Ligand binder design. Structure first.
Ligand code: SF4
Ligand code: FCO
Ligand code: F3S
Ligand code: CL
Ligand code: CL
Ligand code: CL
Ligand code: MG
Ligand code: NI
Lengths: 581, 265
């Protein structure tokens, strides 16, 4: 066994080794290993991406106008975000400016995704780490109604309703066919909700499973379908026609009315179901405000998103702030430049890729994706990994660093950046939320904080949907209908050689696509994705990524039942297809 | 009284097929899961992880050997001895073969499981391979699309449950009900196609009147799916209705059939 110091942690692989493979209730394929000491405390954590497809390789030689459709398939959970980053990157390379309505609609597509993705994550992915579904069977329906009514104005709260939900669960379980609840962690001492809160949460899990399907109707109107809507380089393909012949063949007043109806319903659900549930999880699980801090009190990163001024990606335009904090110095939010070769770099000394020199990091314009499955000595065989060797290569995920620093990205990172840049709405929201929980600000830098920030973001995004929709309608009232710029659609109009960066904030954090075009075709296409940051393996200095740091120092009540590991990992909302692409 | 056991496994994928499934409007995915099937294993949604998830997998395929339906999302890579997709430390293909052996029938969800989809597009770095090239001794129903239509997924499920039989299929294993006709055979813009009324560049006057997208590269004429009739997301739209030509996403190798903006040959 070995031991070394990094980022204030003591990384020690002595003691019992635990393996969690597969990690479930995430997107895609992940393996986690930890070592625990004699006090059942984690002293080593190993994050492993267990899938790879090679989109960066597949994109070579494609027409840049087609790229968005390929890279959209990086992920069907964060569906659309890679298409947005792609059209941004190609437009940046060629020098294309899109019409205002195209930008507004793109912002609507992104805000719609944030609402949908965050809602499903809260209930379907992370929810069962916090809600003991089986314990809901011991709830009093009247007490459940009383609890729900004390927390929210949401209409659906009758004792009869909660009795009906409980009875359905009872009948579901009675024959032994527990389905998704089979062999769960039910009864674990870390489940702290009373039975009435478990029944309320489970009812809401079902309501959210039903309701989420409606949110994406906004993607269907502007983008044809969800998952995987359509886009174009130059704007959007959803031509608008309000008051002319043939409006039946375009985005017309009836289509816009449908969009408005979905926006209102989405805000209602988020504000009156998700938000009170998140706060309730906080109230019953306060110790989790001090678990899973990881890098969130050290290094956080946002690129920023939602340019409100069309084709302007600067600080005055982006509605979601960008910036970086390192070394716990939140008084100095640093500017991020995605072209600067000394800023974003990826390392592969601990990943299954080949570089000419694996001791150096490569900026994505210098990126290389040469897969090399080389696990070394793994206590089994190349096709039977019993124990990853974290001293060498152990993941399909590359290791991104920012100025050589390991960073956390995502809702908590964004919230901290916005808070410390002095965004008034963020400061007010965060302070009020922490006051309601009777917790200090530092309580947000934790596994519980990640969950609270995500719910806050869904509420923010639902509000922004209305703002963007109103902006669109304002343009239409002024007779501004344009949705595409085609001046530079034809390859004959492009520079022979050019390169571009497209960036945004996906639901899970900072996303960048780096594209180089030559002779009308993609010469290089490199992606660094939010879960690539968070689930990163180690670098040449032995610095650990966000997941590994967040798992460090964690007490486990029952080593064989990894509930604490799942709680912290799920709080980051891992997307493994994203991370590896 | 008991519900039919279903094991849903995941290879190399983007998870768009699971996401499409939960969009179902009728029946709601909630009702499919609670009342129509017993969804006994599914990485994306299940409570159990790690060894507990392995225990569920092993228990279900043993207890219900010969009697469960296997749903497959994504596909196995043959490269690097299968270790481009690792599950419980071992190649995904081993779990696929184990799960297939005890299945009564297999549903290959999406273009990934049916054909290969994006990871199989040139130069196919991982040797991603569709299910029917690996499993050769089981009924496989291909339900292609990237992803398939949500209400098509659920209609296929309800058909099998209600009628206690597999859907009749074409020569490629696709259900005739939804894949028997082309997008272009039921497209509401066909009047324009037949009149030579085409969008020529984005947001031109033709686009604003809903003219045909053939000259913009629409692959509807060579693509079999239900998008132009059943439509998407509770009948709200489909690619062509919102102004983009069909990409061909339900067809084998659609990624490599030339630019999406080049006209059908
Ligand atoms: S839009 Fe496409 S599917 Fe419809 S008529 Fe034109 S070519 Fe055919
Ligand atoms: N959100 C999201 Fe997917 C990841 N990680 C992207 O980008
Ligand atoms: S791209 Fe796919 S979703 Fe339908 S309209 Fe074409 S088959
Ligand atoms: Cl350039
Ligand atoms: Cl046939
Ligand atoms: Cl294919
Ligand atoms: Mg990459
Ligand atoms: Ni994703």
């Amino acid at each position: 066994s070995t031991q070394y110091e990094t980022q204030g942690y003591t990384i020690n692989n002595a003691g019992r080794r635990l393996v969690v493979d597969p990690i479930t209730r995430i997107e895609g394929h992940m393996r986690c290993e930890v070592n625990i000491n004699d006090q059942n405390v984690i002293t080593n954590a190993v994050s492993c991406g267990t899938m790879f497809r090679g989109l960066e390789i597949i994109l070579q030689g494609r027409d840049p106008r087609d790229a968005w459709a390929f890279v959209e398939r990086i992920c069907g959970v964060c569906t659309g975000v890679h298409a947005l980053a792609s059209v941004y990157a190609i437009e940046d390379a060629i020098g294309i400016k899109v019409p205002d309505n195209a930008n507004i609609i793109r912002n609507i597509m992104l805000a719609t995704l944030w609402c949908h993705d965050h809602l499903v994550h809260f209930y379907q992915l992370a929810g069962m780490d916090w809600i003991d579904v089986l314990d809901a069977l011991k709830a009093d329906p009247r007490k459940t109604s009383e609890l729900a009514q004390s927390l929210s104005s949401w209409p659906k709260s009758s004792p009869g309703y909660f009795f009906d939900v409980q009875n359905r669960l009872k009948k579901f379980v009675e024959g032994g066919q527990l389905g998704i609840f089979r062999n769960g962690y039910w009864g674990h001492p870390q489940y702290k909700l009373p039975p009435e809160a478990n029944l309320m949460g489970f009812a809401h899990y079902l309501e959210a499973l039903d309701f989420q399907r409606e949110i994406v109707k906004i993607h269907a109107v502007f983008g044809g379908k969800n998952p995987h809507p359509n886009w174009i380089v130059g704007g959007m393909p959803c031509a608008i026609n309000i008051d002319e012949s043939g409006a039946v063949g375009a985005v017309n007043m009836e289509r816009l009315n449908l969009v408005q109806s979905i926006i209102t319903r989405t805000a209602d659900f988020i504000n009156n179901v998700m938000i009170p549930d998140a706060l309730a999880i906080g109230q019953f699980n306060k110790p989790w405000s001090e678990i899973g801090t990881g890098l969130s009190d050290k290094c956080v990163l946002s690129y920023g998103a939602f340019p409100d001024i069309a084709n302007d990606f600067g600080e005055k335009s982006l509605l979601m702030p960008g910036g970086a904090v390192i070394n716990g110095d939140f008084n100095n939010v640093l500017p991020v430049d995605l072209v600067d070769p000394q800023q974003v770099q990826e390392f592969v000394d601990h990943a299954w890729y080949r570089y000419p020199n694996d001791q150096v990091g490569r900026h994505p314009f210098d990126g290389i994706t040469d897969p090399w499955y080389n696990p070394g000595d793994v206590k089994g065989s190349d096709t039977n990994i019993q124990q990853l060797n974290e001293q060498e290569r152990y993941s399909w995920i590359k290791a991104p660093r920012w100025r050589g620093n390991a960073m956390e990205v995502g809702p908590l990172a964004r919230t901290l950046i916005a808070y410390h840049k002095g965004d008034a709405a963020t400061v007010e929201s965060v302070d009020r939320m922490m006051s309601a929980l009777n917790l200090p600000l530092s309580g947000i830098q934790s596994t519980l904080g990640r969950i609270l920030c995500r719910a806050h973001e869904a509420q923010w995004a639902a509000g922004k949907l209305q703002y963007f929709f109103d902006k669109l309608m304002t343009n239409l009232k002024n007779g501004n209908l344009a949705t595409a710029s085609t001046e530079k659609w034809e390859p004959a109009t492009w520079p022979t050689e050019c390169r571009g960066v497209g960036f945004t904030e996906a639901p899970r954090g900072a996303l960048g696509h780096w594209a180089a075009i030559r002779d009308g075709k993609i010469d290089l296409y490199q992606c660094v994705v939010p879960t690539t940051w968070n689930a990163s393996p180690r670098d040449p200095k032995g610095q650990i990524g966000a997941y590994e740091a967040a798992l460090m120092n964690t007490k486990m009540a029952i080593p064989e039942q990894p509930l604490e590991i799942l709680r912290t990992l799920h709080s980051f909302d891992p997307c493994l297809a994203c991370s590896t692409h | 009284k008991p519900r039919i056991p279903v094991v849903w496994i995941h290879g190399l994928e983007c998870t768009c097929c699971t996401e499409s499934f939960i969009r179902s409007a009728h029946p709601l995915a909630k009702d499919v899961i609670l009342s129509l099937i017993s969804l006994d294993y599914d990485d994306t949604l299940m409570a159990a992880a790690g060894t507990q998830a392995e225990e569920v997998f092993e228990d279900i395929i043993t207890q219900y050997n010969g009697k469960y339906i296997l749903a497959v999302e994504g596909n196995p890579p043959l490269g690097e001895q299968g270790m481009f997709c690792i599950s419980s430390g071992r190649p995904f293909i081993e779990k696929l073969k184990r799960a297939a052996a005890g299945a009564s029938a297999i549903i290959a969800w999406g273009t990934c499981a049916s054909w290969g989809c994006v990871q199989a597009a040139r130069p196919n770095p991982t040797q991603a391979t569709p299910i029917d090239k690996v499993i050769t001794d089981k009924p496989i129903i291909k339900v292609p699309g990237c992803p398939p239509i949500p209400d098509v997924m659920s209609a296929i499920i309800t058909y099998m449950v209600t009628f206690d039989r597999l859907p009749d299929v074409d020569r490629m294993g696709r259900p005739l009900m939804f894949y028997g006709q082309r997008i272009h055979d039921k497209c509401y813009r066909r009047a324009h196609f037949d009149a030579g009324e085409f969008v020529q560049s984005w947001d031109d006057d033709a686009a604003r009147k809903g003219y045909c997208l053939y000259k913009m590269g629409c692959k509807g004429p060579t693509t079999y799916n239900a998008c132009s009739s059943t439509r998407w997301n509770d009948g709200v739209s489909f690619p062509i209705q919102s102004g983009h030509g069909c990409l061909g996403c339900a067809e084998n190798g659609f990624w490599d059939r030339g630019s999406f903006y080049s006209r059908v040959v």
